[PDB]
Write a protein that binds this ligand. Structure first.
Ligand code: ATP
Ligand code: MG
Lengths: 190, 292, 125, 524
């Protein structure tokens, strides 16, 4: 567990992109060499160390190919067949796990990747953000536990989006501080 | 002269042809206000003979017992030879149900014909209607879940909210109750017209109303207290929600959000104090029927 | 628990009573430890301590009964003590070494429980 | 000990030292205070254990501890034996103290004499609480009947009629919920033709002014609920059932209802020959002879040999291969004795057996037809051998239960266990003890019949274990009964088996000492 290869490769690719050292074909070849084709286990365990790296890597590979990442891309065979059914009242627990622990992050990392590639910029950021905060919450459902990790994750990706966009201001960060005050919006000390 | 006789004949045919008119007549006789929309839908759904293995779920206080009593008295008013079994949680409830049945029989004019003939066995536990022949099994039997189930065969079985905190708090209690519920089916007679009905409200994370559906093949319908409160709560039931509620909520889905389904009896401020009596988990369990 | 009980009895009985309101230590058998240690150090009478076995704990009932038999000379009291211990021991399972001790004490008192004979013979294997 | 002063906060322990925490001087006062604080516990089983402790003390000469308990009861002391931050249930402690005293007074009540002035304070009609009056009067009359005291005749006549409806010639947000109102207040008001909305204003007065609570109805007004001491819905209830654990709102409403009821006897005539007693006995102990259910429990009977020896067999075949042998054990527990009625289960780690027995009387010639008639059937659940010509003989166990159903020492037993119908007891001149355990003839030394019942009260997340009830009789008695009723005996047994992770027969007994079946005959 905690095989660090995906995080190091992703960091190398991000650094190469931001300095314009490489072409996108080289990046596609390199990511294609390393991303698994069958989805790996960590996407449905909330305490597996690897999960965020895979979510970031798949989102970046999807946006490099001009797509946008969707839940059906990360899904295994059984839950893909479930997502091709219609007359269902039921919903499997190993589907609700993938929605709860991975699904809420898909709207955010798409915007992050779009800002990284220069496809979305400062002049129209807020309309995306206010939309994205809605689009996540509709997926979110009942967080009956106070021990959810997801708020701590969302704060990090939000701050990274601001810092990467450029020309930040004090009020922008104060918005994150204000969002942290509601119940369940827990942010940890590191 | 003749006009009133024609009126009497038409009315006495019509009441045997329409459950909802019978409810209106009975509730005028009881000096109660007019039945609400959800009550009409519940009675109409109950009256349809095509549901053979059927469960109805509704929030607390809606009217289940009165509807059940009016149903069984109307059923024997239309066919006095039927065998009906009523199962309840405890002795007190069974006695209350049987007494209320006798009160309905004596209250209305024409139902007085159903009074029993000498050789009555007019007991509080079981009794015959007068038009029934002398026979082994009684017309109506009322019993608690721990009582004497053995010794008869039934055509119609009604369960009146058997699962209770007083009888499901321990592993032994749940196992015993599970055996008793999964043993009723041998009592039913094998004619094509026989049917069984459950009415109740879930009390715990495990509920037998879900076990009968997931394995034994029953079919269930749900009436929540208010229209769905968010999108993910709405996504919990699409086949299960009552057709009127789903038919409305497909269209006005933004304005209907969280609105009370029966404002004639239960306004928002009367539902709020329930959410002050109990935590949000309890309110969601008993009024939204969504166990977390 | 033993040192606190030994240092001042009247204070200990109040303190362990407030602990049970706070649910501090409800998974242990505090009352049995306190009462038996106070009996051993001769600070409380055994006939006062014997009726407390109606509270369900890990009691050593034969030691309490032996402390009663060794202390009081009245023929009434030991008969009553045997009756109380036997009744509140009757309904849950025991090993033979307890039943034979109770039988011996019954022979010393002058009573012959055929019930006890049968219930000990049924386990003699 | 002062090294800790830099880390000790408030809300560590009881807080800083204050003189109100000082213990009593003598040890026996502290022991009495422990028992007094356990009588007031919010969990019912602890209250029954403390009641048994008081009953055990009173059967000895333990004067000092008993006098300490009554002194605590008089002064209504709370704090040195209770937490400073949690509310204390005084009236529960006093009610269970009355319940204990009323049982002490039946057998040998002399220990209650030096504190007699306690009970005289409550057995008067200017005390509005119904149940405490009831049990105080029951204690005083029981001491009067034993010739330990003497009561003047008009005072006796007042005590014996304490809850008679003598007066025949005559805004707040607190709400009573979805279950307490309709199932607890409405049957009380139905005795006087009054709806519960008409009787809420007296209840609110009693809560706000006498009991002294002045908050709101919210679920987090109870400290034990806020700190999450209750668990797995022990405090939930419905349809008139009692809870296992009493939370604060239930305590307040429970005592306010009995204080409300006392005012209506003083102001308003009742509607029908007495309806009030049939309401009140819903809230009383289970037995009419004032004994407890704990007196009825017996130890389990000796095991059937087929069970011990068949325990080693492999399981799948054992669920399907019931031998005939077991039925010979079911009819005859022991030589000279036969099982007349019974229904029980026997449990091990992997298997369980269930056994049912029935008996009835049938006309001597017609019995030979009925033996063939009963066995030639499609089914055995669609007909029943009856109970109190084919004629019933035994009356079956009662279903109703009282508030001592939560006593741990009574193993969930029920008192009227089966017995012969009245005409058998009359015609055969039988006599019995105070708990109907053993029955005797007017002519023989050996017992006619013996009845017994056994079991346990199940805790949470725990296994089931063996329980049941049985009635048995000697062969000489049933022979004499058959020769004087002039009848033949038909009886039937079921045996059934289940797994943990039916075989049915009938026998006909005739007075020349023979047992007959469809397939063969058997003799002693
Ligand atoms: N439309 C109505 N208007 C006014 N009162 C009504 C109406 N319908 C029923 N009631 C009364 O309200 C109560 C509702 O009936 P009831 O208590 O039997 O309901 P329930 O569904 O069985 O309850 P619960 O879930 O509490 O067991 C009855 O006392 C009835 O008389
Ligand atoms: Mg009801």
């Amino acid at each position: 567990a905690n095989n660090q290869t995906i995080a190091a490769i992703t960091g190398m690719v991000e650094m190469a992109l931001i300095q314009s050292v490489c072409t996108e074909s080289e990046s596609i070849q390199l990511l294609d060499r390393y991303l698994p084709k069958v989805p790996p286990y960590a996407l449905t365990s909330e305490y597996s160390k690897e999960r965020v790296a895979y979510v970031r890597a798949y989102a970046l590979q999807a946006n490099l190919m001009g797509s946008q990442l969707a839940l059906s891309d990360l899904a295994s065979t059984e839950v893909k067949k479930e997502l091709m059914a219609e007359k269902r009242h039921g919903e499997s627990d190993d589907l609700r796990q993938l929605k709860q622990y991975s699904g809420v992050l898909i709207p955010w990392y798409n915007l992050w990747a779009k800002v990284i590639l220069g496809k979305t910029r400062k002049a129209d950021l807020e309309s995306e953000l206010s939309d994205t905060q809605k689009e996540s919450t509709a997926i979110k459902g009942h967080s009956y536990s106070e021990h959810s990790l997801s708020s701590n994750e969302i704060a990090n990706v939000w701050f990274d989006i601001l810092i990467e966009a450029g020309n930040v201001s004090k009020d922008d960060v104060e918005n994150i501080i204000k969002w942290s005050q509601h119940k369940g919006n827990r942010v940890f000390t590191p | 002269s003749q006009s009133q006789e024609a009126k009497n004949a038409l009315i006495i045919a019509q009441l045997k042809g329409d459950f909802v008119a019978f409810l209106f007549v009975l509730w005028k006789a009881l000096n109660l206000p007019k039945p609400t929309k959800c009550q009409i839908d519940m009675a109409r759904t109950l009256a349809n003979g095509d549901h053979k293995k059927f469960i109805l779920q509704a929030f607390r206080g809606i009217g289940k017992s009165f509807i059940t009593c009016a149903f069984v008295v109307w059923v024997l008013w239309r066919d006095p030879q039927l065998k009906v079994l009523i199962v309840s949680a405890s002795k007190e409830r069974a006695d209350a149900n049987s007494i209320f049945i006798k009160n309905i029989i004596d209250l209305l004019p024409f139902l007085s014909e159903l009074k029993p003939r000498p050789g009555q066995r007019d007991s509080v536990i079981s009794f015959d209607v007068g038009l029934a022949k002398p026979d082994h099994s009684p017309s109506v039997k009322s019993v608690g879940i721990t009582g004497q189930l053995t010794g008869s065969r039934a055509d119609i079985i009604i369960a009146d909210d058997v699962e209770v905190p007083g009888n499901s708090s321990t592993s032994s209690a749940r196992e015993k109750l599970w055996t008793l519920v999964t043993e009723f089916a041998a009592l039913l007679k094998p004619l094509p017209t026989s049917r069984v009905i459950y009415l109740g409200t879930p009390q715990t994370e495990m509920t037998l109303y879900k076990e009968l559906e997931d394995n034994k093949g029953y079919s269930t319908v749900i009436w929540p207290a208010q229209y769905p409160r968010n999108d993910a709560e709405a996504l919990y039931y699409g086949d299960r929600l009552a057709p009127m509620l789903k038919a409305e909520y497909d269209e006005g889905f933004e304005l209907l959000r969280g609105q009370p389904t029966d404002p004639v009896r239960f306004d928002m401020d009367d539902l709020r104090e329930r959410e002050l009596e109990y935590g949000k988990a309890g309110y969601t369990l008993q009024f939204m029927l969504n166990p977390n | 628990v033993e040192i606190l009980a030994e240092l001042c009895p009247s204070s200990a009985l109040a303190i362990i009573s407030r602990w049970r309101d706070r649910t501090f230590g409800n998974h242990r058998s505090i009352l049995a430890w306190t009462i038996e240690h106070l009996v051993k150090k001769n600070k409380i009478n055994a006939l006062d301590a014997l009726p407390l076995i109606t509270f369900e704990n890990d009691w050593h009932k034969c030691d309490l009964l032996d402390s009663v038999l060794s202390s009081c000379t009245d023929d009434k009291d030991k008969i009553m003590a045997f009756e109380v211990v036997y009744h509140y021991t009757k309904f849950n399972v025991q090993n033979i070494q307890n039943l034979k001790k109770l039988d011996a004490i019954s022979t010393s008192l002058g009573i012959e429980h055929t019930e006890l004979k049968e219930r000990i013979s049924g386990l003699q294997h | 000990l002062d090294l800790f002063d830099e880390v000790l906060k408030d809300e560590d322990g009881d807080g800083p030292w204050n003189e109100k925490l000082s213990p009593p001087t003598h040890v026996e006062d502290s022991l009495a205070g422990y028992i007094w604080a356990r009588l007031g516990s919010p969990e019912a089983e602890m209250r029954w254990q403390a009641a048994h402790a008081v009953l055990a003390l009173c059967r000895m000469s333990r004067t000092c501890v008993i006098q300490g308990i009554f002194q605590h009861a008089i002064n209504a002391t709370t704090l040195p034996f209770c937490d400073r931050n949690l509310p204390f249930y005084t009236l529960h402690a006093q009610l269970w103290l009355m319940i204990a005293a009323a049982r002490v007074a039946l057998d040998d009540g002399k220990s209650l004499i030096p504190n007699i002035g306690y009970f005289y304070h409550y057995a008067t009609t200017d005390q509005p609480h119904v149940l405490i009056r009831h049990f105080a009067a029951r204690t005083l009359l029981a001491l009067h009947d034993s010739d330990l005291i003497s009561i003047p005749a008009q005072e006796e006549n007042k005590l014996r009629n304490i809850n008679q409806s003598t007066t025949l010639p005559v805004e707040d947000s607190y709400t009573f919920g979805i279950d307490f109102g309709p199932y607890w207040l409405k049957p009380l008001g139905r005795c006087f033709g009054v709806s519960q909305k008409q009787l809420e204003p007296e209840m609110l007065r009693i809560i706000r002014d006498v009991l002294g609570f002045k908050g709101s109805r919210n679920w987090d007004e109870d400290e034990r609920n806020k700190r999450r001491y209750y668990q797995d819905r022990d405090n939930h209830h419905s349809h008139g059932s009692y809870p296992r654990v009493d939370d604060y709102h239930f305590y307040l409403s429970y005592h306010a209802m009995f204080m409300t009821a006392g005012q209506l006897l003083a102001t308003k005539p009742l509607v029908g020959e007495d309806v009030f007693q049939d309401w009140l006995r819903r809230h009383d102990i289970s037995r009419n002879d004032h004994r407890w259910l704990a007196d009825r429990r017996d130890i389990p009977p000796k095991e059937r040999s087929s069970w011990l020896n068949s325990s080693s067999d492999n399981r799948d075949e054992w669920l399907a291969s019931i031998s005939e042998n077991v039925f010979n054990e079911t009819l005859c527990p022991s030589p000279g004795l036969l099982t007349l009625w019974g229904r029980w289960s026997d449990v091990c780690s992997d298997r369980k057996e269930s056994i049912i027995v029935h008996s009835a009387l049938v006309s001597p010639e017609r019995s030979l037809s009925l033996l063939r008639a009963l066995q030639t059937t499609k089914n055995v659940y669609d007909y029943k051998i009856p109970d109190a010509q084919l004629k019933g003989w035994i009356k079956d166990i009662a279903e109703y239960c009282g508030i001592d159903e939560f006593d741990p020492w009574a193993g969930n037993v029920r008192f009227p266990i089966p017995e012969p119908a009245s005409f058998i007891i009359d015609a055969m001149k039988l006599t019995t003890d105070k708990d109907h355990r053993v029955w005797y003839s007017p002519s023989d030394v050996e017992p006619a019949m013996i009845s017994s019942i056994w079991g346990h009260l199940s805790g949470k997340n725990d296994e089931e274990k063996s329980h049941g009830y049985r009635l048995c009789a000697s062969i000489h008695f049933i022979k004499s009964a058959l020769e004087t009723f002039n009848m033949d005996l038909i009886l039937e047994v079921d045996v059934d088996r289940y797994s943990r992770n039916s075989s049915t027969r009938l026998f006909l007994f005739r007075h020349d000492g023979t047992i007959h079946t469809l397939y063969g005959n058997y003799r002693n």
